[PDB]
Design a protein around this ligand. Sequence first.
Ligand code: XAT
Ligand code: LUT
Ligand code: LUT
Ligand code: LMU
Lengths: 213, 218, 218
Amino acid sequence: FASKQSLSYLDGTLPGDYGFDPLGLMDPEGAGGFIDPQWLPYAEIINGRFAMLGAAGAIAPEVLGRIGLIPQETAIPWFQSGVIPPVGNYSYWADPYTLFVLEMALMGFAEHRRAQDYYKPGSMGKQYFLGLEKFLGGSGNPAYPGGPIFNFLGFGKNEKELQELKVKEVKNGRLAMMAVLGYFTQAIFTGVGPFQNLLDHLADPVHNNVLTN
Amino acid sequence: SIWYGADRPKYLGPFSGETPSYLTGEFAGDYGWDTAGLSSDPETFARNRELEVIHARWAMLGALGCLTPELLAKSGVKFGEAVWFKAGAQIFSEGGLDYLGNPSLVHAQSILAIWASQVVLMGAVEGYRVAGGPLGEITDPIYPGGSFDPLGLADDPDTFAELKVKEIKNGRLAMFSMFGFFVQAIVTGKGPLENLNDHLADPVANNAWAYATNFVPG
Amino acid sequence: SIWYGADRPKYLGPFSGETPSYLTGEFAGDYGWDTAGLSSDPETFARNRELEVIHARWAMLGALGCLTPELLAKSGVKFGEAVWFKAGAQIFSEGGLDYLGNPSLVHAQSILAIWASQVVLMGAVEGYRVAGGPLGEITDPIYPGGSFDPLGLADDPDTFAELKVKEIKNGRLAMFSMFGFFVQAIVTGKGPLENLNDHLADPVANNAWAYATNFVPG
Ligand SMILES: CC(/C=C/C=C(C)/C=C/[C@@]12O[C@]1(C)C[C@@H](O)CC2(C)C)=C\C=C\C=C(C)\C=C\C=C(C)\C=C\[C@@]12O[C@]1(C)C[C@@H](O)CC2(C)C
Ligand SMILES: CC1=C[C@H](O)CC(C)(C)[C@H]1/C=C/C(C)=C/C=C/C(C)=C/C=C/C=C(C)/C=C/C=C(C)/C=C/C1=C(C)C[C@H](O)CC1(C)C
Ligand SMILES: CC1=C[C@H](O)CC(C)(C)[C@H]1/C=C/C(C)=C/C=C/C(C)=C/C=C/C=C(C)/C=C/C=C(C)/C=C/C1=C(C)C[C@H](O)CC1(C)C
Ligand SMILES: CCCCCCCCCCCCO[C@H]1O[C@H](CO)[C@@H](O[C@H]2O[C@H](CO)[C@@H](O)[C@H](O)[C@H]2O)[C@H](O)[C@H]1O
């Protein structure tokens, strides 16, 4: 499968398995220490999960301004929101450093609890806290945990449905990651937002190749 | 030892196919590429191997020496002349040929003295390379070792083979780079760094197609 | 037959002279012309066989593709550049690659994209040739057969041998014609059709040796 031939290191059993691994990083000779059988798929799916939100939010302000139901002051380019202050800045109620510290502290809490659960499955299920041990139950594998609050919808009744959903998720993650890489390339070449690039190929199909500059 | 084994990556990649009968490995940089069929004779094979390694070392030195002065001049170093194919004219300049533009260094003014010294010294060293001299005796034509490996980086035969592969690969890359340097210097007329800077901005028309019309008859 | 038996045409005719031992019969249209002994080694000789076959096929195709456009231009259909060595400006003209003068056909505008397209395609094609592929598995590099002889016109060994001999001789004719084309382009600077038209009118006046006066150095 997967264009170039496989080497049986993976048989397709893993969720979202395709076999397009020409180098084979999980080769046991080339695998060790940091490389862990559990860790690589987990890292891939997390980079993809955050790529979901990144790809969505790199266009959500611009498309919302286009349709006409968001304030026009939120039509700022995605790189001008404060991610790279040298390029530009966007208005806020507090300094970017303050919101940065807030978000780093909160992500520190969340990531720390998640990493403890990954390292020790009993984290936030038998630890000490104000009654959240019974509300953060560790179920199944760490990468696909679920829980009393995570399974509020209750979707995913059958294992065939689970594998279908998960292969869809990994495919969507791969396409989102390629989309986001294209986002940086367009930002560094044309200096504009990707939504404007859509406006251009829609307006001028033969507008430009690469940058011609 | 993937390279030396009977299964090696070859020059087509995974999809190689036919491999020459004699090319069973046992040599650095063996990619099974003998489409011309020139090294069928064993002694001819040894001679071609010697030519390859000597050319590779000379071309690595040449690429380094053709890039370094140009990079220094671009970076801000003062030179009498920095273009690799123009550096020979400094011996005919009034200011003379000074190393790093410093009149206190070399300060050579005559081409005949340089030519005579080069002929004598290179004749001596090539005679040593062919028959052995002050720095040792001939044991292997290409890999003498001893005084030319004073630090002993190739004592372990496995590491020796790995270093052979590394050296031959870097050398072949440098040879290809030197051929590129020659053709680009004769086509464009500017140094390799100028060509790279041209390709940096607007790569669409900064290529060979821009000059593809300079050699049309008429 | 005549080609394969001792009674061969040879390359000199009456002067058979000394003939190389390995180049005496049992080969496709051999004439005993090895005056420099390149292919003494059997491997080397085989490799020369495939090299000659491939150069011959490409020479045939190139000669046909150079002959057809100027003949069609003289026929009457509009051609921006029917000259074989002037086809480069087709992509350098604003109109583009108008196949048979039609902007509604092909009508390319860039060179990088098409060049990369072919580099990928022909790399895959040649790779399939050397190492087999989904199309078929090659039984001999020189003359695979099968898909490339779908009608099986050369099923009979005698007609196969005769057609192979004709292919080799026509490939050598294509060799010589392409060499003539190249020399005409470099020296005269015009297409072959203009050359033949000029040779028709006053053949003694229109001669190759009128262009030999300007090759003096200085
Ligand atoms: C996570 C990610 C993107 C996340 C983006 C986020 C969060 C963005 C957030 C914001 O932008 C918004 C929305 C707008 C503003 O608020 C600003 C910020 C705050 C900045 C991309 C991942 C991107 C990930 C990428 C590109 C991964 C590529 C991997 C490749 C190509 C691997 C290839 C191979 O590994 C195989 C498959 C097999 C091997 O055998 C061979 C090789 C070839 C090694
Ligand atoms: C493999 C094979 C196989 C089969 O057989 C087929 C075939 C094809 C036959 C083959 C192939 C081959 C090849 C590829 C080859 C190549 C070569 C080369 C490139 C060389 C170079 C080579 C190169 C070289 C030496 C170079 C050198 C250089 C030098 C010294 C330089 C010097 C200099 C400098 C510094 C600087 C100054 O200012 C100048 C000078 C003074 C000038
Ligand atoms: C045999 C022998 C024997 C004895 O011993 C002696 C000796 C010497 C050894 C030997 C000999 C040899 C010889 C003579 C050779 C020759 C060759 C040739 C001529 C080739 C060509 C060859 C040729 C060829 C391929 C060609 C090709 C081509 C192509 C692809 C293409 C083309 C084209 C076209 C279409 C179109 C465009 O627009 C242009 C062009 C681009 C142009
Ligand atoms: C103005 C001129 C003053 C004299 C300088 C020139 C003298 C002529 C040069 C003679 C060089 C002879 O060199 C030849 O014999 C030498 C021994 O004598 C060998 O040299 C060998 O023995 C020497 C001493 O015995 C050792 O210092 C060397 O390390 C060793 O390699 C060389 O391997 C050989 O190439």
